[PDB]
């Protein structure tokens, strides 16, 4: 194992794409502004966004 | 000294009022949206907001 690769926390565009990808199973309403959510969260990882989506569905 | 009083980090409205109070000396342009700034910052204290305003003036 030679190549060391660092994987940081996601930025705004990646959080947009993560929130889009974690919601293709559920039907959401079209007035939900996901870009506003991704702008508001800074130190979140992918598991945190998945936790938010799961609590909403619950 | 009897009464213990805890003073937390400021919330959104307090950050709005801090950013307003730290700019009465300088002339700012009227298209600056301070409420957006106060919505974006969460863990900032008063010294951090004063630092931002000072770097802008510089």
């Amino acid at each position: 194992l030679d190549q060391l690769i660092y994987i940081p926390l996601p930025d705004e565009k990646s959080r947009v794409a993560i929130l889009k990808a974690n919601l293709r199973k559920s039907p959401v309403a079209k007035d939900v502004d996901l870009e506003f959510l991704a702008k508001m969260t800074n130190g979140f990882s992918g598991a945190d966004l998945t936790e938010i989506c799961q609590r909403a569905c619950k | 000294l009897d009464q213990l009083i805890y003073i937390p980090l400021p919330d959104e409205k307090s950050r709005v009022a801090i950013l307003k109070a730290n700019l009465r000396k300088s002339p700012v342009a009227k298209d600056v949206d301070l409420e957006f700034l106060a919505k974006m910052t969460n863990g900032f204290s008063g010294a951090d907001l004063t630092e931002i305003c000072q770097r802008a003036c510089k």
Binding site: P8, L9, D11 | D31, D33
Partner: peptide, 23 residues
């Protein structure tokens, strides 16, 4: 010295910060 210089870094974020261009 590089490590102490990196302890004085800004918050890891806030690049490409923009106000909403609202007419």
């Amino acid at each position: 010295y590089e490590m102490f210089a990196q302890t004085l870094q800004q918050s890891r974020g806030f690049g490409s910060f923009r106000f909403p261009s609202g007419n």
